[PDB]
Structure formats: structure tokens, C-alpha cells
């Protein structure tokens, strides 16, 4: 698997993923690259229709579900928490997706974009230190989501 | 290998999975022969009868549940999230099993045909980079959809079989 | 190792006809049970608080699920659903040694999963009966019970 | 961890555990020594109190007193005695019995069968209650009881 | 690295007797401790009930059953005797143990539990499947009146009762 | 890679006093952390409600407890004492490490929490089989007042009040 690049604009804190995926954020776990972005090692959103589990037909309209991305101790975290517990909406979050080139170097093919997005939990873990780091999930709503395959030319978009 | 391939086909946006297998769509994963379908590393399906007590035989109308399989972020993804948010329903949807044959070659021996199949639920998830235990993995979109009609058919051997799932 | 199932329909015959030829499930063929289902697990419970609860087998996608699915949803009853267990006996082979017959067995649940985004796609399927008997082939202990 | 060795007689069939570990009953894992008792891979227990016993658990393969252990359950029927032989290495290099459970007029209660397919031999959970129960140290003296 | 544990109840006598000898376990005989049960596992739970939004302190303190796992061993039988009958337990004692500088084990942290009673006895065999190691296990779990931590080698005492 | 923590008591004083010294700890003594425990693992949620088939933001914020796992060491009889008679945690202090450049563990990233409070201790030992050539195991749970978080490496702070 491939991480993903993340792009967050906040309305107050600015750009909160600036420098996220540099040394002095990851450590060694540094990117050349991504500098204003950070790293995604874990992605999850779920979009839902209510169904009447009989029929089989809908029960109700569509349920945006919280996006979710996981990171380490980087150094949008506090910012991240000021977010959170100010309420902060973000304009745009932006990630970018990568996979295994022909090349042999990662290639973005697919981008995810959630306008007005709002915090809504933040989850730190860190796993027992007895190669991996501490996991922090962070789980937004939003107003709007666009879904774009930039390699083959799809897109696609819903409101919240 | 093992995966199998689905042609998806609506009702507003014609052939969704329209060149779905193919280098722009995924890669280094292409697979020269099902462009237009969808590559699925992962289906599942359930149907039952209730039973409804310690009585212990059928009881009432059976109860197809939603079809699913899953896949990673191809070309008709953005194409399959329309679908769910709009309701787009799907006249039919085929799904194409293969196995290892005689000559060590991929065989096409099972099909799953749908028949007005709706979209309920899509669910994406990456697993983390833990370090090449990950290495092989991608990300996966569970795709969820109810359906009118259901054929069986075992192409490699002859039986066929189908039912409805009534409304009501 | 897996064991062997025959089932016969009241309506669709010999429903296993054909389960474990190399046409039905390819390389896995097994050269000597043609009509017979190749059962990768089985699962069963009796319990008192006698309830009897369904008897399951978990099978691949082989030629007699078509018919499978048409018996589950047509309710069609199986008057004979017979499981043959082996083991690996002294000299070198398998030897049948238990049989489980199930009487006038009707499906109610087929769950299909594939897995693994080396092994095969697997079918479970759940069944009510009227009666079981067992019998430990090789050792002459048998068994039996109504629903 | 070394199997346990069970020897059941059942009020209407006997000794259930007749020929139970024989070559004819398991196969290619025959152990001479206890061709009358069940060789026994797992086994549960629990008692609690808010006293309350817990139904007495074995897990073993099919064999041959298996189909006899379902009319057991299948009819109720009272098995006077349960006995549960445990083993362990010893300082040589058998293992030796050092621990015994003695049941008295169990019931069985749930028989649960289960066929895994990397793995070996299917299983099969044997569930009863009792009316009494004895616990045994038989290599250092103590003992215990206790009704149900 | 396991622990140690001497029980004595009201009726019995030494429960923990012998607990640790050949004829009570076997090669796995560990001279020294030999009137205490070696614990393979232990888990134990203390607690302040919450109220989580508007948080912080909606009650008293709550004590949990403290609980260890052992083998098949002489005490066994004595255990379930005071699990049956209520025996009250005047003292529990549990002895950790880490590595030393030495090479050898070193006593550092001991718990203490004074009017103890067993609550559970859960006992599980796994499967022959390999396991060279593996062995049955005894989880007993008991509720005390007291209990008194010690971390030996630095000194440090603290207690509550239930 | 662990973290370590100073904990400051309003009625004991520095309770995180010597607990990563060699009398507490043993072999894993770490000099540099001598007043602080160290922390194999840590745990923490910060959470807003939301209406689920409406719009997101309804309620206050709920913070969750901060929790953090370490051994038994001489530190654990007093965090006891602190849960049990409630005491009010002045500070405590979080300092969070990674590999560095020159090869050795570099801090990073510093949580603090003001006037925390102790509302769970879980302690479980695992089952020494291989596999487990490691210690004990003692969550502490707490909440608190306020916490900060900052990165100490690259100057980001943030902060809140509960």
C-alpha cells in the first residue's frame, strides 16, 4: 500500500498541513515532496443508503458518513486539536492518492476533495513499544465531496 | 489468477465499468482481456429462509441480501459513487468468476448475473504501510447493491440456476 | 481431509451429480467421489436447555450450487443428505470411517464469501432435516434422532 | 500439552468409552494404554459464584463412542461416572497421571462438532452437568469435592 | 519472569503448601518457592465510576476481583474446597519478580490481600495443535477486604480496603 | 521510542520520583528520565457529537481520559494512593521521543495535562509461554482540566480547557 497526501486549509489556522512531511515533523519517516501535506497511512469513509432489509428499495435518502484519515505525532496535530475544539471549518481538504508507477516510482492517480470540512474526533494510539509509530485518526464531516480518477478522466461529486 | 471481473451497465450513465481494467484505470495491475470490467479481489452474498423458532423449519418469505464485491480505486469509482447518491439503477450487472485450468491458464467457469441492482453502500478503506505486511495490498471499495433478479449459471458445466426478489 | 456429500432432491434428482469432476471444480478434482459434494468444513449442534440445530457444510463454487440455490428458494426437501468422513488409515490412504444421514433435509441459508483481496471461494450451506442417524463405519457404533 | 484420557459409563449403554482409543476408533493416532477411555484434546470448566457449577466441557475427534455420546444426549441419559485422567511429562521421559476429575451421574447437555480445513482432525465438544464433582492431586494427596 | 503466592484460609492451612514441587507440577518444579502457587498470569482492576460528558468524579472508588492463573497443582483441589464453601482467606501474597544484575531473579514488588475470597475458578485446556509448551491453565479470581502494594526494592507503600 | 511522564501530586508530592531508576525498575534502568515513568503505551480521544442524518456540529466537546501504560515500579503504590483518595494531579507531563539523525531518541513532542485526576488502574501480566520476554503491564487512566500539545521539534502549540 501506498500513502496518501493530505492537504487541509483552515478558515483561522491556514494552512494546517504546512510543513507536515518534513524532518522536523517525521523524523526520519521524512518525504521529499509532500512538505505542505501529510501523510496518510490509513484512509476510511463509508457513504450508505437506508434500506428496508426486505425489499431491498431504499428507506430514506443517502448518509455521508465521517472521512477518516490516520497519521503520526506530525506537526499539524496541535493545530489539528485547536480545530477540533474551536470548531474550526476547513474550506478544502485535498488528498491525493499514489500508486506503483511503470517507472518504478510512485505516480498520483486519484484525488478526494472535501469542501467546508468540520472535526469531529481525533483518536491518538500508541501501539506498545516492547519500524511502527503512534497512530492518530482524524475523522471530518463536510458539506461536499468530489471524487476524481485524474489518471483516467472520471469525476464525480455529492453534497452532504 | 482468482479475481473476478463484473461488467456494470446503467441506467443514466451507460457502461460504468467502460475501460475499468485498464493500465490508466490501475496500473501495474491491468489485465489485458476484461477492459471493460471491473477487477474484484473480493465478493460476497447471502440468501436464507427464516426459521423463526424452536419450531425449526421455514417459517416465512425468504430474504435475498445485498451482493457485493470489492475493488480498488479504478476508473468507474467516481462513476459508481453517482450511481449511489443518485439511485442510478443498474439493468445488469455480470460477474465473472475464473480459476486455474487445465493447461495453467485462467478459466472463465461461473456467472453471477443481477438484474435492476441498486447501489447501497460503498465502503472504502486503506490498510496502513506495516511494514511488507501491507506490501501486496491496496486499498478496497466495498460495493453493496439489492437487485430484482438473480441468475446462477455454471458455465464450465451446464447447471443454471435463478430467482426474484419480490417487492411487495 | 474433506469429506464427501451426496444429496438427492425430491424434485431436482441427484442434486450432486457431477459436484466433484474435474469440469465442476477444476484442478481440485478428485478422481474417485464424481457425485459427491467436496465439503471443506462442517459445522452441526444438538443442544438441550432436545433442540436440534442446522447442519452446515462449506463447499467452493461446483456445479451443483446452481441447483443448490434453486432448492433453497424454492423450498425443495432432500430426502437424503448422506456425509461421508475420511482419515488417513495404516498403509498409506484415506479410509471412509463415519456417515452422518440427514432425512427429508430442507436449506435455509447459503452464505458465499470470497476471500483473500491461495485457496478457493466458499459456499456455506445451512440445512434443517427431519432426522439424523450416525455411524462410525469402521468401528460399528451407530447412532440416530428425530427432529 | 498432553491429552487427557476420559472413561464415561452411561446407565443404559455402559461403557461409553468402550474401544474409544483404538486403532479401529482414531486412526493413525491410537495410543496403546486407554483403548477403553476418550482421548480428550481440550477441556473447559468453570464454577462461580455471585455457589454455581458450570457445565464440565471435553473436546475430542469422531470416534467411536461418538454416535453413542449423541444418544446419550439425544435421550437424556444419567452417566453414573465421568473420569477425567490427566497427564504430564515426567522426569523421565513418559508422560505420568497426576490428576483426576471424577463426575457423578452426568448429563450431557450440548454436543457441538466442528471440521476445520494448515490444520488437522475435526472436533467435537462434549458439554455436561452434574450431580457431584471430585477433584484429585493423585500425585501429591489432596483432593476436594463439591455437589452441584 | 512469574509470581509467587502463599494463600491461607480460615479452615484449611496452608492452601498454598507444597504448590510448587515435583509432585505438585513436575518438570516445571522451581525449587525455593516451594510452599507458594506460580502464577503464570494475574490481572486485577481498580476504578472510579465516570460521568463522561461534564466529566470527572461521579462516585467512589470501586474495587474489581483480583485474579491469577496457575497450573494443575496440589493447591487446586484446596481451591475449589474455598471457592465452595466461602472460606475466607486472612492473607493472599503475591511476590513479582524480575531480571537481576546478578543473571538470577530479584523480589521487588509484593501485594498483599487480607480477607480474601474466591469468586471464580475458570479452567481451560488448550488443543494438542505444535504447543511443546503449553499447559492446562487455572484462573482464580478473588475479592479481599484489603489490599497493600509494595514495591520492595525502592520502599513506596500505599493500601485501600474494598 | 517510549514516552516518558512527570507527574506532580497535590498531596504526595512527585509521585514520578525515581521511577525510572535502577531500584525501580531493574535492568531497564534509563538515565536521563530518572523522575519520570516511562510509558510503553499511551491512549487518548477528543471527540465532538454530531446529528448523524443532519448537520455535523451539536453539544459540547467531550474530552476522554488520557491514559498511559507502564510497569511495575515505584511510582505504582502511590498512583494507587492517588486513585483511590482522589488526588488532584497539579501536572502532568508527557514527553514523546523518535529515532533521531545521530541514532539516539530525541524528544519531540510534549502533552501536558493541569489538575488531573486518576479514574482507572488496570494491571495484567501476560502469560509467560517465548513471544513474551516482557513485563507487567499497569493502565493508568485521568482526566483533567486542561491539556496542551505541542511539537517541541518543529513549534506548533495548541490547547484546551475541560
Given at each position: 500500500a501506498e500513502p496518501a497526501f493530505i492537504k487541509i486549509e483552515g478558515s483561522t489556522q491556514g494552512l494546517i498541513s504546512?510543513?507536515?512531511?518534513?524532518?522536523?515533523?517525521?523524523?526520519?519517516?521524512?518525504?521529499?515532496?509532500?512538505?505542505?501535506?501529510?501523510?496518510?497511512?490509513?484512509?476510511?469513509?463509508?457513504?450508505?443508503?437506508?434500506?428496508d432489509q426486505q425489499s431491498g428499495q431504499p428507506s430514506?435518502?443517502?448518509?455521508?458518513?465521517?472521512?477518516?484519515?490516520?497519521?503520526?505525532?506530525?506537526?499539524?496535530?496541535?493545530?489539528?486539536?485547536?480545530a477540533l475544539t474551536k470548531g474550526e471549518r476547513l474550506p478544502t481538504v485535498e488528498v491525493h492518492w499514489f500508486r506503483t508507477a511503470?517507472?518504478?516510482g510512485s505516480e498520483h492517480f486519484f484525488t478526494t476533495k472535501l469542501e467546508d470540512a468540520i472535526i469531529t474526533?481525533?483518536?491518538?494510539?500508541?501501539?506498545?513499544?516492547?519500524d511502527k509509530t503512534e497512530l492518530l485518526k482524524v475523522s471530518m464531516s463536510?458539506?461536499?465531496?468530489?471524487?476524481?480518477?485524474?489518471?483516467?478522466?472520471?469525476?464525480g461529486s455529492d453534497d452532504w
Amino acid at each position: 500500500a501506498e500513502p496518501a497526501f493530505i492537504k487541509i486549509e483552515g478558515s483561522t489556522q491556514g494552512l494546517i498541513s504546512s510543513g507536515a512531511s518534513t524532518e522536523a515533523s517525521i523524523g526520519n519517516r521524512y518525504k521529499s515532496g509532500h512538505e505542505d501535506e501529510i501523510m496518510a497511512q490509513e484512509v476510511s469513509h463509508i457513504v450508505t443508503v437506508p434500506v428496508d432489509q426486505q425489499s431491498g428499495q431504499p428507506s430514506g435518502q443517502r448518509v455521508h458518513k465521517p472521512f477518516s484519515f490516520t497519521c503520526s505525532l506530525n506537526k499539524s496535530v496541535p493545530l489539528l486539536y485547536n480545530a477540533l475544539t474551536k470548531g474550526e471549518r476547513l474550506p478544502t481538504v485535498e488528498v491525493h492518492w499514489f500508486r506503483t508507477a511503470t517507472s518504478g516510482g510512485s505516480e498520483h492517480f486519484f484525488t478526494t476533495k472535501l469542501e467546508d470540512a468540520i472535526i469531529t474526533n481525533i483518536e491518538l494510539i500508541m501501539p506498545n513499544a516492547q519500524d511502527k509509530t503512534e497512530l492518530l485518526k482524524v475523522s471530518m464531516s463536510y458539506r461536499k465531496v468530489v471524487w476524481e480518477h485524474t489518471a483516467a478522466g472520471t469525476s464525480g461529486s455529492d453534497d452532504w
